[PDB]
Amino acid sequence: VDPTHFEKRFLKRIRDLGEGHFGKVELCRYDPEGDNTGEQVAVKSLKPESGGNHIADLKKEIEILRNLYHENIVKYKGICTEGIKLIMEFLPSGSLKEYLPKNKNKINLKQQLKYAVQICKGMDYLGSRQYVHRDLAARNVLVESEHQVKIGDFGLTKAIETDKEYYTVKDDRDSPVFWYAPECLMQSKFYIASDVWSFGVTLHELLTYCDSDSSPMALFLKMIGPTHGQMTVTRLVNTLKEGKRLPCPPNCPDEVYQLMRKCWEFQPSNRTSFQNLIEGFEALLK
Amino acid sequence: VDPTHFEKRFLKRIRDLGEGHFGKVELCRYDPEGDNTGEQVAVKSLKPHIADLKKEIEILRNLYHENIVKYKGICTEGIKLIMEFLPSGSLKEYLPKNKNKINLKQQLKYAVQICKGMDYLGSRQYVHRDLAARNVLVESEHQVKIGDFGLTKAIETDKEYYTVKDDRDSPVFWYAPECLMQSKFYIASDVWSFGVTLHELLTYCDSDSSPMALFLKMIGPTHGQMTVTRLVNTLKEGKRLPCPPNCPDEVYQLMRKCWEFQPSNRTSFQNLIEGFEALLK
Ligand SMILES: N#CC[C@]1(n2cc(C(N)=O)c(NC(=O)C3CC3)n2)CCN(Cc2ccc(C3=CCCCC3)cc2)C[C@H]1F
């Protein structure tokens, strides 16, 4: 038997974990013994809908996650074929967005800096394999335990071609624009330095314990004036050009805010790296 | 009796003409004799904004020009703007239906009449911000009139521009790049919109070669959130609407001078008037 092969007849759906880009992540139990004793797994699959090659993109995402092995990347477990499904480990603590509001008392600055280092190690591993992530946000950072996080979704991940610095996207609809670097918004070009910008925003979230009233979206929309959505993105672009950035989170020491600010240099070439952030956080943790 | 006060009791509804920015323009007969003999008028009102309608009323009341739709008065209880009725409607409805009658010479005379109406508005220090074929009314085969001023704004003396930015329903496919990027409106922003409107007139307002259709073919039906950035980016690359079918190159060149990226580089309405008059000799 192939232990990465999950038979559909044994994969009993429990409930939805997430919805997004014409598909869903569901909690299922794999129960070949039929007694509710099998392992819980997270299952990604497309709605019957599909089209503008949603299938070829999921199949690419499967092949991406299958060959990633890092302690800060969610584990591939296998596939279910029929409309293919990606099977992953289930992390019952969910994302930082679920976990941090409930665990403020147990998660102090030292733990938040450790989680920051673990996200950066994950992201630097993905960069080392020539991938741009394009969706780095607290909602995609999963909690393994109070001491460990893992990057938990790869649905926008693209390979940068060898001898090229960026990937140009066509398919655009559902962009998380409040996490996107200016080159992504203005020119739909994604560099590794674009993942750093997003990392800066995800650190802001981590340091505000993912409070909905302090989310990047809620703070950017307070900043930017009367506007349509059609006009939202262009007003956001104009604010970033003038040099406005998310404010320092409450209780956030200025030395951590300075690391975050280096993520948000307007020009990709001027931004800090992931290895540089890891160094700066470890220095704070000594 | 004030001949600009219209009594609500004698304003008989016939039908709707259009809808926009949280209200409508209806056809009514003002019929104080109650025998169906009263004049037809166009009436702009809000559903149950008020302050902006009052400003629009005060702008139009004080504009007098052969190529600007005639203010007739108000109905007060709430307020309604009463305008002259032009039964031939907008260029968007008229051109498709009258291609046999309207040749290039007549299209160039409509172009001059729009430019004269627009340069009059400019000299009163207004920026229109909504110049499109759907807002140019046909008086007759030989005469057009700018027919709606609902987005019109004053430019402050010794300022070059007005910043909106009550922004949400912009006609983006007619907007200059300063309007898209910074929400800034100059007299030169109206020259860019005129360029798009001359494109519509020269294609006899065909839906399939509207500025919107043509720009979306060019950038893709992408997202709308991202639609406007992608449009900004395409105008930066230097791409413009193509030459309409059958449109001579020297007309197209005057059109292209409306679409210089920098406002300070765009043609004036006076230069457009003279360039066309030169073509009609
Ligand atoms: N990372 C992350 C967040 C998601 N997630 C994964 C898990 C997990 N493995 O335990 C999880 N656990 C919980 O919540 C626990 C119960 C609290 N949550 C995955 C992505 N989804 C959004 C999503 C959904 C669908 C798609 C698709 C895109 C294209 C292909 C088809 C599907 C992409 C992203 C949210 C959480 F489920």
Ligand SMILES: N#CC[C@]1(n2cc(C(N)=O)c(NC(=O)C3CC3)n2)CCN(Cc2ccc(C3=CCCCC3)cc2)C[C@H]1F
């Ligand atoms: N210009 C122009 C186009 C409109 N129009 C005016 C006339 C007219 N005077 O004879 C007219 N004739 C016809 O159609 C004939 C029958 C073919 N058509 C006016 C604007 N409307 C959109 C519109 C509607 C409502 C609003 C409001 C904004 C806020 C205040 C309340 C209403 C703005 C623009 C389309 C045609 F009626």
